[PDB]
Structure 1
Amino acid sequence: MTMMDMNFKYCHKIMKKHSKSFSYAADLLPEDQRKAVWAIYAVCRKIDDSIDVYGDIQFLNQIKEDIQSIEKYPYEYHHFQSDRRIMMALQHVAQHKNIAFQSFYNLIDTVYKDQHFTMFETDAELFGYCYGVAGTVGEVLTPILSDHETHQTYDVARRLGESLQLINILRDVGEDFENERIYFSKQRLKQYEVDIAEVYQNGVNNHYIDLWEYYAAIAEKDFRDVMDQIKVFSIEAQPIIELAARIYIEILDEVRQANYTLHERVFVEKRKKAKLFHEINSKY
């Protein structure tokens, strides 16, 4: 195992640790796509965790600075300030695929702003945050998952990412409230007669379901439109992308089965993941 193999193995472990949902999916990819996804995931995990988990703002500027170094001087040796093993992997990727650095910067800005957190007044603000935190990961992942880096491909990847974040939000309502976040819209909450602090304390009411279901329909419709345009990805990536997406669509059915609980984080079991993949691969 070489120096660089070790760097990507560290990234793998980070994703194995943090992505209960998607680690299983990514490791189905061919060796070179797989390794790139690990590195990107690890860069993204480190970004999201910098403040929220490590409570470390300087580590976030350090991550930005490391990425900036890679963008300007992809072939030099850098004394990376944040996590050396990840940044070296990311640099390795960037020598072989072209990376939309601006997408890492958008994610960084969103993560920064997600401290002075202010409830979205409008859904358009909520969707803007879905772009910031997930659409950009979609964009960053595009050259790894497709040989066609055209607008259609960036577009489908961006929309897929954005729809997964919405399901994410739909899974995490109660947990986010515990950490003092409501991602549902002030407008949409005022419309549906819903206060999250109240259904947390008293239990799921019919107003809440209507509202939750309003949003799940947005995410299910966008998922379906992504699926129709899946041939935009490479042939080996398609079944996996479809897996990762059908896993999240399964999350919604779990929330539904748990009567929309706000007091427990639902999940898809590993065994049900393989069932899904078996079903998907039949088409392929």
Structure 2
Amino acid sequence: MTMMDMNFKYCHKIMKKHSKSFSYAFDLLPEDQRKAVWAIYAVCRKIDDSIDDIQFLNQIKEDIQSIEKYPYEYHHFQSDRRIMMALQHVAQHKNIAFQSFYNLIDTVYKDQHFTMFETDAELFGYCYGVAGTVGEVLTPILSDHETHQTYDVARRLGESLQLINILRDVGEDFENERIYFSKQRLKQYEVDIAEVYQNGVNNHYIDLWEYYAAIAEKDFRDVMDQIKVFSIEAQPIIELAARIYIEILDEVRQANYTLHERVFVEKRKKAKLFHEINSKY
């Protein structure tokens, strides 16, 4: 086991620890793409966790900026050396959309002074910023020949997974003084998240919730129709990852839209979906 290997194995460990669904799916890729995904994931994870002062976050961004500007020089990285070595290795072989990392970093900067979204257009803007961008970064890894269409589909997939995420974590997000539903939309459906958190679900909350779920689902289906932008090996894997994540919606409904648990897709269910998909291919 080389050192580079150790860097990637650490990235993997972070991905397994933090996302069971994406780890489950993406570990099925060929070795080289697998590892590229571990590293991009681990970077994005560290950015997302970095605030836990802007101190660390500035260092990550400077690291990323060193790699962009000097891909083949040795850097003394300021943040997480193992993750940054791995990302540099990836960049040496693959076209990385660095500005997409900076979009993500800017978005995380901004959650410091967080204020609720006035309109769905802001919320969807947020979904681009934290997920759409990541879809774009992953594009060269998951497709042979990259076009505006490939980035488009990847970005839409990312944004739809983010919305499914938001839909899982309503209650936990509330505890952490975040609400992601737009004020426009809360007013229209006459929902008050505080009230629902205390008094349990109702038919307003459920309608609002399902408004957003219907959007995520439609975007999901539009991605699937276009799965072919991706390399032949990645298609079944990206369909797995998406399907496993959208299943999260059925889990929320079955738990009656609870705001006091994180629902989950059982591992045995992940494998069921793998079967269904792996058989179509």
Q: 2 CA distance for matches of 1:130 and 1:28?
A: 26
Q: 1:238 offset after TM fit, Å?
A: 0.5
Q: 2 CA distance for matches of 1:168 and 1:116?
A: 21
Q: 2 CA distance for matches of 1:206 and 1:142?
A: 40
Q: 1:270 offset after TM fit, Å?
A: 1.1
Q: 2:184 aligns with which of 177, 184, 187?
A: 187
**Match of residue 23 from structure 2:** 23
Scaled by the length of structure 1, the TM-score of the pair is 0.98
What per-residue deviation string (whole Å, max 9, x for no partner) do you get for residues 142-179 of structure 1? 00000111000000000000000000000000000000
Which runs of 5 or more structure 2 residues have no equivalent in the other structure?
Answer: none
Q: What does 1:49-128 correspond to in 2, within 5 Å?
A: 49-52=49-52, 56-128=53-125
Q: 1:12 offset after TM fit, Å?
A: 0.4
Q: Secondary structure at the match of 2:51?
A: helix
Q: 2 CA distance for matches of 1:267 and 1:21?
A: 9
Q: 1:180 offset after TM fit, Å?
A: 0.4
Q: 1:269 offset after TM fit, Å?
A: 1.0
Moved more, 17-26 or 244-253: 17-26
Q: 1 CA distance for matches of 2:205 and 2:235?
A: 35
Q: Secondary structure at the match of 1:21?
A: helix
What per-residue deviation string (whole Å, max 9, x for no partner) do you get for residues 99-156 of structure 1? 0000000000001101111000000000000000000000000000001110000000
| TM-align CA RMSD | 0.6
**Match of residue 38 from structure 2:** 38
Q: Secondary structure at the match of 2:253?
A: helix
Q: 1:212 offset after TM fit, Å?
A: 0.1
What per-residue deviation string (whole Å, max 9, x for no partner) do you get for residues 17-70 of structure 1? 111221111111110000000000000000000014xxx411000000000000
Identity rate, percent: 100
The alignment of Structure 1 onto Structure 2 pairs a total of residues equal to 281
1:201 aligns with 2:198: yes
Q: 1:78 offset after TM fit, Å?
A: 0.1
What per-residue deviation string (whole Å, max 9, x for no partner) do you get for residues 231-282 of structure 1? 1100110001000100111000000000000000001111110110110011
Q: 1 CA distance for matches of 2:96 and 2:170?
A: 33
Q: 1:228 offset after TM fit, Å?
A: 0.3
Q: 2 CA distance for matches of 1:148 and 1:268?
A: 33
Q: 2 CA distance for matches of 1:231 and 1:98?
A: 20
Scaled by the length of structure 2, the TM-score of the pair is 0.99
Q: Secondary structure at the match of 1:279?
A: helix
**Match of residue 171 from structure 2:** 174
Q: 2 CA distance for matches of 1:266 and 1:190?
A: 27
Q: 2 CA distance for matches of 1:94 and 1:239?
A: 25
Q: 2 CA distance for matches of 1:32 and 1:20?
A: 20
Q: 1 CA distance for matches of 2:112 and 2:144?
A: 37
What per-residue deviation string (whole Å, max 9, x for no partner) do you get for residues 200-255 of structure 1? 00000000000000000000000000000001100110001000100111000000
Which runs of 5 or more structure 1 residues have no equivalent in the other structure?
Answer: none
Q: 2 CA distance for matches of 1:248 and 1:281?
A: 17
Q: Secondary structure at the match of 1:51?
A: coil
Q: 2 CA distance for matches of 1:231 and 1:281?
A: 16
Q: 1:192 offset after TM fit, Å?
A: 0.1
Q: Secondary structure at the match of 1:117?
A: coil
